[PDB]
Structure formats: C-alpha cells, structure tokens
Symmetry: D2
Subunit: 387 residues, 4 copies
C-alpha cells in the first residue's frame, strides 16, 4: 500500500540521507555515504531523482582532475540507474571563509570568490539536467546590530543575483533561480527571513522573471507562520518554483524531521493546496534522519517521507470529492469568496444604497460561518473516520 | 531634560491613550476619554498630532447630523490647539459584521460594505489634512485551514486596494496608503503577516506607487523577526510611509507596551537606522497604557514614549559621532560592504584569477571580523558608560 | 459512530459554550446563554457534567436573595437532567478590582477580599458535589520588572493557599485543589507559568497532599513545551488531579480551540498516555467556539471535542495492541528503560569492569535506536492506514 | 572604568573561550586552546576561576598515564596563577554512545557507563576544590513520542541522582549538585525543560538537600519565560546553587551570546535581584564568542561579559538608592506586598465585614497602580539619564 513510483516526482538531497549526524553538541554517529550508493538506494525506494551542493559531490579543494573523477562516477550511476537531477545548489556556508556570508560578506574579496564558486556549479548543474538552481543564504546576516548595514547588504545581494542572471542569459541556459528563506540559524538573524521578504526582494531584481522561491516547511514554522498560507501567496504570485518538504515541532532550532512529522494538520492542508493547485514541480525532501538511527533507520525515514505524502494526498482527494464537504463549503460561502466584490465598478458601488445606506448590518452580523462543522469534516477525512 | 516639542513629529492614536483597559479576560478599568480632551492633553505634552479610526471619532451608527457634530467639535480643538492629523484609518474589526473580515469576508455583501465604510472615511481624512491612510486587516484570515481559500482571498484583497486607488486618483486626493502587517490575533493567522509579505503583495497592485507599509515594532517581534532589519528592507524598497512605535516582550499576545519597553537594544538600533537614513515621517506611537493605571498613569506612559525616543536618539548620535566607533567600523570592514562586488563586470570577474584560481582561502578565513568589540562600544554608548 | 455517553466522563465549563465571542478587538457575536439551557443541551450531547466560576452562575454583586434564585434554578436543571458538577473555580480576574491580582495584589485589602470571595464559592461547590476546586491565577504577575517583588508575591501566594487548606480541613470538606498554570496573558508574565513551576510551588505548602495541577494543553504549548511530557511528570509525582483539553497552534495568544485542533500528534500521544496510565478524572474541555460561529456551530464544536477524543482513543488502543508495534518497542529497547540501572547497588556498580573499564563504547555507539520505524507505525495507526 | 577583580567572583568554562566555532552548518574557525593558556589569560582579565567538563581537560579515551599528565599541567597553572575551580561537570552528550541519553538512555549498559564516567569526575572535581557539580542532561529526551516512556525515564533519572547522592555522602565529600535545565536542542524536547520542572523533580529525590538548580539566562528564554521571575522562585525555595549568565535574542536556537547582549532589560532586573538578595555564588559565564571572531575577539567578548555585569550592578544600586524611586515604590504599594494578608488568622478574616460584606469594591478598583512611572524611573537609571 501507498507505494511510491518515479511518477510521484519525489526527490532527495545527497546531504539528507547522507547526513552523518554531527550536531552543535555531538560528533558524527554514521559513516559517510558514497553518492553513488545513495543514488542506487534511492532508485530502489522509488525516488524520481536527487539534488546536491557542489561540496556534497566534489570534496572542497579538489583538483580539476579529481573533480572530473567524482563527476564521472556520479554520472554513470545516474545513467545506469536513470535517476534525474532536477535541482542543484552551492555550499556557501560550511567553509570558514564564509563565516560572515558569501554574497553579503563585508570583505569584498570573499564576495567575488562566492560568485565564482556559484558560477562554476551552475555550469555543472545545467550539464546534468537541473531545471532549478537554489540559493540558501545561510550565512547572510548578523548576531549584532552594528555588524551589518542592511541596506548596503541588500544592494550587494541584488548585485550578486543580477550578475548570476546576466551569466545564465549570456550562456543561453534554461535554468531558473529559487531563493530559499530561513529566519535564523546559523546566524542570529538571516537576511530575507521569510517567503514574503524573498518575494518582495525578487521584484527589485533586473530580470525578476528568472527568480522564484524554494520555501521549506520547517523554516516558515520557525517564525510561527502558516506554511500553507505562505505557499498560497507564492502560487498567487507565480513564484513557486520548487519546494522543500519536512517537519518541524514549533519555534526552535531547525529540526528537518521527516515529512509528516511535526505539524500534521499543516501537512494535510499543504498537500491539499499543492494537488488542487496543480503544482507540477519536484516534491523534494530536505530532511535529516535523526542521529539516533543506523543506516536501516536512514532508509526507513526516507521511505516514510514519501509514504506520508501519498497517504495525505489520498485523504485530501477524498475530502474534496465528498458531496457532504461540497455542501459544507457552500454553507460557509467559500463559493462567494471567488466572486468579484465589485465587478460592476467603482461608480456603481458608490451609488448602490444596498451596500451602505440600506445595508442591514445586524442581519449580516447574525449569520454563522459554519466553519467548525467544515473543519470537523476535514478532521474526519484526515483520520479516516469517513471516506 | 529630553523635552519633546512639535518639531519631533511625535503622534498618537485616539485609541491609545483612550484605551479603557478591556482585555479578553477583564472589564474596562478607565472611563472613556473625550477626543477633544485627548487633543488638548497631548498638545500640552509636546505632541505633534493625533490619528484616528472612523469609529474612535464618530460612534458607529451615528446619523449624518450626529456625525457632523462630532467632527465640528474635533476640528475646533484642532484649530484652537493646532495639532495635526497626519494619518487616519478605518475600523474594520470591532463590529460583529466583520467577524470573518472586511475586504476578504466570504460574504460578498460584507466586502462591499467594508469598501463603502472605508471610502467615507478617506473623504474625512483628506479634509483634516492626513497624508497617509493606514489599513490593518486584523480580521482578514482564519482559524482553520478550510475556511479561507487564500488565493481567492488575495484576489479579493487586491480588488479592494485597487478600487481604493482608483477612488483616490479619480478624486485628485494627495494621500497614500500604508498596509500594517500583523501575523496573528485576533485571527489564528492573519493574511499578509509580515512586512515582507505586505511588500510583496503591493507589487501586484495596479498602481504600486500609491502603497507602502506601516510596520509596527511589536507585530514583527510576534513572529520573532528582527524589526530594524525589516525596516531596512522597507527603506531599501522606498516603501516606509509611516511607522508604529511601541514595545513587546517576545512571542506572545500583542502587548503594545510604551516605546522603549520590551526589546531595548532593538529600539536603539531602530532609532539609529531611522535617524541615519533621514526618515522624515511621523513617529507614531501605537501603544496601550496598561490597565493597571489610572489617568495620571496614562499621561505618564505617553510622556515616556517620547522621552525614550529622545534619549535613544541622543545615544545613537553619540555612538556614530565617536571616532573610536568610526575606527571600529573600519576594522569590521563596514566600509567595504558599501563597495560594489564587481563593478568591473561579469567578464572581468570571470577572468580574474585572484577571485578563484589564486584566491588564498585560508588567509581570508583567518581574518577576524572584530564584531564583538564594535558591539561592546555600542553597549557602552547605549548605557552612557562613554560619550 | 464514536458516540459519547456519560461513562466517557466528558465535562464542559459554562464559560466555554457560553462564550459570547468578545475578544480584545471585537464586540460579542452571540447572545448570553442561560446556564439552565447549557446543562440541558450538554446532557443531550452525551456530556457527563459541567463546571463553573462563581460569576458564571451568580451575577457579580447579586444580593443573597438573588443568589439563591440562581442556584435553585441551576440545581433543578441538574436534578432533572442529573448532570454532575465535578469541578468549580473562582473568577478572580474579570472585575477591575483584580487588575493587579487577587492573592498577590499589592493592595492588602484586595487580597483579603479575594480570599473571602473564594471561600464563599468553595462552600457552594461542595454542596453541588465538586471533587476538585481549580485556581487559575490569571492576574497574578506583572508587565514590568519593578512592579512585583516576586519572592514576596510567592509568600502571599503560599499564605493564601495555606489559608484555603486550613479552611477546607476545618470544615471537613472532601475537596482538593488544582492549580492551573499559564505563562502569560492577560499579564505580561504570570506567576507559576508552567506545570513544573506549579508542582515545585506545591511542595512548599503546609499540606501538600491537598494540592495538584490542572494543566491545559494550550497553555504549556504557549511556552513551546511538550504537553504529554509535562503530563507524564505530573502523573509521576501523583499530582494530576484534573485536566483541561483543547487545541493551540503554537506560540501566540491563548486560542482555546476545540480538542483535536492544533497539534494533532500531541493530542494522540496525550490520549495514549492518559488511557495507558489509567487516568480516571474528568476529561474537561476548556475551549471557545470561534466567534465566527452561530449557536449551531457552538454545539457542533462541542460535539467535535468529544468525537476527537474518542477517535484518538481508538487509534492509540490499536497502536498499543498491534504485535508489530510491540516488536518495534522491543527493537527500540523501551523494555530495557523500565529495568533498574543498578539494582545491584552502588558498590557492585563501582566494581563492575564491564560498566567502564571493559565497556565497548564503540559497539554500543553503533547500535541504531530504530526510532523512525516505530514513529512511522504510530503515524500509520493515527491515520488509519493499518489497524 | 568598571574593572573586574577576583572579588567579583566572575568565572568561565574552559569550553566557552575555547569554543572553536563549529556549528551545525560549519567547520571550526579557530584553533583549539590549551587549557593552561586559558587559565593564564582569564587570570590576567580579572577572572576569579574556571570550570570544566571532564572531556575539556582530559581527551576522551586517555590512558590513566595520559590523564595524570593533563591534570598535573592544569594544577600547576592553577597553583602559579591561583585561579579557583568552583564548579565542574560531566560531558554526557558529545560521544556517539550518548546519542539517546546518559542517565535515561534506553540501553541499560549505557546508563551504567554514564554513571561510572560521572563518578570518576566527581573525585577529580573535589580534589581541585569544586563546591558545585553541575548536570546538564542535554541528550535526555526524544524527537518522537513513542521513543521514550517518560515516567520510566524519570524513574531512571531519579535512580541516577540518588546513586550520585549516595556516592558523595559515603565518601564524605562537601559538594552539592545543580541541575541545569534546557527545553530543547540537541533533542527535540529535553526532560526537565525549565527551572520549575527541575525544582519539582528535586523534591522527589531521596536527599533533596544535596540538589539545587543551575539556571541559564538563555535557556529559560528559549521557552519565552521571564528569567528574573524564575530565579526569584529558585531563591524563594533555597535552591539557587549556581547560575549561568549569557544572552539570547528570543525563542530560537541556543545562542550563548555574551552577558548583556540579548534581552538587556531582563539582564538589569536579574542583576538587581541577585545583588539585592545577596546571592554569594559564582557569576559564571556560559557563552560562546561568535565564530566570526579571531582570538582578539574571544578575549574582548569575555571582558565584555564582566564589564556589562559591573555596569548593570552600578545602575541597579543607583536605582534602589534613589529617594524618588523609594517614593515611587511606596506609591505602587510594594511595601504592602510584604505585609501578611491575614496574620490575624482564618477566623478573624471570616468575621471581618470590611473584607467582603462592607468592602468598597469600586473605590479599590479606581486606585491606579502607578506602575508606568516606576518603570520609567527604572529606564532612566538603566540609561544613565539620572543618578
Ligand atoms: O541548498 C539549499 C539547502 O542548503 C542547506 O543544506 C540548507 O540547510 C537547506 O535548507 C537548503 O535546502
Ligand atoms: O488603524 C490601524 C490600527 O488599528 C488597530 O487599532 C490595530 O490594533 C493597530 O495595530 C493599528 O495601528
Ligand atoms: O477556572 C479556571 C479557568 O478560568 C479561566 O476561564 C481560564 O481562562 C481557564 O484557563 C481556566 O481553566
Ligand atoms: O556542564 C554544563 C554545561 O554543559 C554544556 O556545555 C551546556 O551547553 C551548557 O549549557 C552547560 O552549562
Ligand atoms: Mg531546515
Ligand atoms: Mg531547505
Ligand atoms: Mg500591536
Ligand atoms: Mg499598529
Ligand atoms: Mg486557555
Ligand atoms: Mg483552562
Ligand atoms: Mg546555552
Ligand atoms: Mg549552561
């Protein structure tokens, strides 16, 4: 039951199942995985493809010769298996040179290096077939208020993404960028901390059509925000290029639990939205098998990601298909929300006495919204206490 | 010492000093204030002006005759005193008819009523001299996931603000709109929950130049965000039309404490930013004297708002004027943050071997940022342990 | 399906279904309910009993004659219907006289009044059959640091509960006290903010055996704490006298959603714990039907409270009864957690070389805990994707 | 100005200034420090002493010979310099064998090993002069609900601390234990998550007089709690054995900023409480110089810890010594809070008609608390805008 196949478009970062379990207070609990082995094991689980940072695939500081040997091995696992690489990204956060940022480091020479490191990996990503290039500015930010002039830092951030867009357009590459927001950790505050701030920033870039967002469930929840609502606003803007699925239990450190763990009802409403809106991009899992687990547990946690997506998809489809739920949606006037408020125009509205002068405010105030009955039908479907 | 005068542009809502102290668990502890009395008492404290909701000034349901008597009394207090009215707003949240929203209520007839109520008060605000019209969509949102289709709700929100912009432009009014974000309370989640989401939304309106943000200190802190950083992004976008100053102790209910209470260091960095960026708009206090206080305490809390702004202004000016701080800023390379990363252009950067091939990553990694010494100088200035 | 009956011991406060919907920003949306009507409607839904504050039943300031008429009406609804009154409490928070607290108000005369008001309602509660008397110190606390000397306030809090214990013991009443913690709202910080602080405080009272806790789901979640863990510690101490069930979406204002809404997985683990530990007290719902709802929605929300408890009970029972889950629990060594670490004693442990000198740390480090497979079985049972 | 001397009792963990800057997303940015060098550098800064984990001083897995060489070097730096070692603790969190806990690991053999590792370091701590032995159960907890039966885990936690108390009493050691709470990180939820839960747990131990708390500023703030209030409750119980001072900006990952950073007003009220209550224990800094810093920044951040304590001490002393503040405290009735509510006894209170029958509730309700004027005097003193 609930068996994933490549058509479900489930994808995984090399850094997810490959996380060795080193955390701020503890050493690694698992050995390093060979990327070739992860490709083959994920293929057998029913995954559609993999993603990577440059440094997940090619050890930092590798010669041009060593680099080619790592890429060739990886390509032949893709060719043998035929896993896809739909997305790639840059590691601008692990090496000590990035301790104050990549694109917004105060030192100019570090910012130039960050751009050259990124451009080198765009070339590789395009060769392997990636459609989306993600940027997570995990070191862009500050612990203290004087350390970063944020207007200048946003100028530098805009400069960097503008240069990246000039690069891809001059090369003729068919690849788009997706900014992944996070509010904090590892910096005290990170720039562009939510989906909203990232969407707003994109609108000031020279070629906004090249850029969208890669929101992550747990990151928006680290600010206590409603993740389905934020995804809805990204869809409404035409900017949901990619998505990171995982779980998070509230406002605390970034947990990266397996999808379905954490806020289960938010996961239900997210899947309902993605499916009913026809999102066609990868369902990418950015998660960490807990460091309590051995390698059997790594693969069980990865399988659980896909399983929980497939169960929630089934329950959301059943919810929307239920005639009793359609009747409830009409009783709560969700259909009236889709009608224009004033398609008759401003002048008609101003002359309409039934909209103000003769509006019966007390009758309208007395109508119940019937929202609790609707939400209990949704609870019943989620729990399988009806079909 | 630290005496406010009208040139400091301090303003107050009628609903602030006039809050009677009714909270979710308690009855009012203070009598209602006459708006005429608040104007006169604020004038004597050194305030520049007042702001209002329609329902603060004119009791809901008032006849056209009663309405004119309330406005005439209020205008003559302004004329006698000569207080300014720089901003006004609409109450689309108190009456039970708005229990599911104004602009995004599921019922169409409520949405039309909300627009007519707003338009009536724009006319009045323009008559009294307001430059900014604020919208706080406090009821726009949901407690449960099925109650609100958020893409349709954003269509309705866009429709409403587009109609407002068509109204002011057809009337020839010189007034701009400012959206005030809040993440939650009184709804479980409120639409456009942060400064970033509001900035992003504005860019999809038909006439974006008419709209900006009115951020509030405590609202962004209810999402755990860095308020000076968010203000910096609003300034960078050209959208800081107005600001609400107050205090908040972390992630919890909206406290609306007096400015300076709550996160004191964030208040210091906010004042440093506003003054050094040359913000010229009103310094508006959206605060609630705690319901423990009698009327003497109301006016003492209001005076403390202005006093704390003036003290912080002095300390921030002293910080920036200190040659030892200028030297610290150079040691942390804040001046290098303002230089373009690659004004030599993309092709020059790609051919620069000192940016990648010959970049000494380990030397760059070893440089300290000297951020702690800078932050301790800022602490010393804030505390007056140097000048 | 999932039909509640009186044997399920579901109870409701008069103030829950009777909440008129007035919040910090809005007027009431529903008329006041007659307590007699709530008793009869809850009886028909399958409730076991009701609870009350003094002021829910007898209007504040009522004469001794008026008081008796309200009590007589209420008793005859109980007698006709035969609903139980298992718990009662005092309103020490609504009236303006309590704006700085009841038991810990700075004014001594208010503290004496608070004690006399409480004692009067203990007499009534005992007459109606209550086994537990709850105290929620919602006004005990502060918005600012100088307002409350917290050591003196804890002396006064101890004095008050000691006097209450002296009163009940001198009267021969068979009633115990339960302290209900809350971290904030309506005060900036409330004293005894969590289950842990309340348990610690009880141990300094003169007769600790008379006092326990009444934890509320949403209150502990307002501090981001794990509610099942806190309930486990209260059970371990022998102090879980009563419980408030409801839902809360994270760290924000107190939502009091219907049980099952909010953190659904935490609700599953809570019901699993209560049932497997044999909790025999009332399952009390302290919830507010959202003010969007009319009276049909009030009763639907109340029915949903009980329904969700009964569904979760069924899924947790199925989880624990599944032999595949029992095998998973053994694979994760939950059975070894129940064995004493060192029943052989300190001297034996010190002389055991297999515990340190010859302990193979690397073999032990390599064992996986198999926690993810266990948690996915729990997810499958919760969702009804196995039985 | 504000120069620390050994009489100020400032202490530092070896792991604080010695933190190499490795975080969840990044490699170390600083070389390892020799403990001998930290002792000498801290002595020159004016520190009173140092603290350590076993593994900070003796590399894990060291032979008995190697162990003695590390201890001898360290002792001679203490003897030459004469720094104190007032506290020590055990590392039960870094090694992979502790991935599921030390004292509450599901595997019994790990729990026995954890106890033997702890006992070995108690012997050493007593030899070096430590008065307090801290336990931070950073791995005791869970990411998922089924992984840990919390009642059994609390039995095992009690068993372990009881065995430790039996050990120290049988040896005749003059050392007490202090439990350091933390709500989460690195586990999803940690057992005994706040000061309150730790105080409650102590009361169930066999010899409660041997155990107290070591609260940390930032840990309680990770739950949004008021740290001075929690310290007040620990003092009221007689259990504040030790304290960790640092800074934290709200609810997020554990930042361990330098003391004074983070919530500055809470730091003021904390120092006011510690000094006015006569706390005589070490002022211990558990902080991490940010990984942006080189070694000059490490020592500047450490000096700033002590400086900010000394400045806040001066401002709090000036606040309490100001006759205008004493008058404000009387106006807010802080002196009435210290009088017993009912030293005349229960029977006198019940017969006092001025406490209920003839209590003028409306006059009492009308008195203002004057809390805002008091808090603005506190703000003025903190900022040095009066003396
Ligand atoms: O490349 C982007 C990825 O980089 C890092 O691993 C982040 O932790 C993860 O959030 C993000 O998706
Ligand atoms: O008009 C806008 C104002 O309306 C309401 O009173 C809000 O509580 C306040 O945040 C806002 O500034
Ligand atoms: O009597 C105790 C009750 O009183 C109040 O209504 C509180 O809001 C609720 O939390 C509590 O259970
Ligand atoms: O030994 C106790 C110490 O151990 C760990 O380093 C903790 O991170 C710190 O909070 C604590 O004070
Ligand atoms: Mg993450
Ligand atoms: Mg991610
Ligand atoms: Mg507010
Ligand atoms: Mg506001
Ligand atoms: Mg509640
Ligand atoms: Mg309750
Ligand atoms: Mg810490
Ligand atoms: Mg600590």
């Amino acid at each position: 039951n609930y068996q994933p196949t490549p058509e479900d478009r489930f994808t995984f970062g090399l850094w997810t199942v490959g996380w060795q379990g080193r955390d701020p207070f503890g050493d690694a609990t698992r050995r390093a995985l060979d990327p070739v082995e992860s490709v083959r094991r994920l293929a057998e689980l029913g995954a559609h493809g993999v993603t990577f940072h440059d440094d997940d695939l090619i050890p930092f500081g590798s010669s041009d010769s060593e680099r080619e040997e790592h890429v060739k091995r990886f390509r032949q696992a893709l060719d043998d298996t035929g896993m896809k690489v739909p997305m790639a990204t840059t590691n601008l956060f692990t090496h000590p040179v990035f301790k104050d940022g990549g694109f917004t480091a105060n030192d100019r020479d570090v910012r130039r290096y960050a751009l050259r490191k990124t451009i080198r990996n765009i070339d590789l990503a395009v060769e392997l077939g990636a459609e989306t290039y993600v940027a997570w500015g995990g070191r862009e930010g500050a612990e203290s208020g004087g350390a970063k002039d944020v207007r200048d830092a946003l100028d530098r951030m805009k400069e960097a993404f503008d240069l990246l867009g000039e690069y891809v357009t001059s090369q003729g590459y068919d690849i788009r960028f997706a900014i992944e927001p996070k509010p904090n950790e590892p910096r005290g505050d990170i720039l562009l901390p939510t989906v909203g701030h990232a969407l707003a920033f994109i609108e000031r870039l020279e070629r906004p059509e090249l850029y969208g967002v890669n929101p992550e469930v747990g990151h928006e929840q680290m600010a206590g925000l409603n993740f389905p609502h934020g995804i809805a606003q990204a869809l409404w803007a035409g900017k949901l290029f990619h998505i990171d699925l995982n779980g998070q239990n509230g406002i605390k450190y970034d947990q990266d639990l397996r999808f379905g763990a954490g806020d289960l009802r938010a996961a239900f409403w997210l899947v309902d939205l993605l499916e009913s809106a026809g999102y066609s991009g990868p369902r990418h899992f950015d998660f960490k098998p807990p460091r309590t687990e051995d390698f059997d547990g790594v693969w069980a946690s990865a399988a659980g990601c896909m399983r929980n997506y497939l169960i929630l998809k089934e329950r959301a489809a059943a919810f929307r298909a239920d005639p009793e739920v359609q009747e409830a949606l009409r009783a709560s006037r969700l259909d009236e929300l889709a009608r224009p408020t004033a398609a008759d125009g401003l002048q008609a509205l101003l002359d309409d006495r039934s909209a103000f002068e003769e509006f019966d405010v007390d009758a309208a105030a007395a109508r119940g919204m019937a929202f609790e009955r609707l939400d209990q039908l949704a609870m019943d479907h989620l729990l399988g206490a009806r079909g």
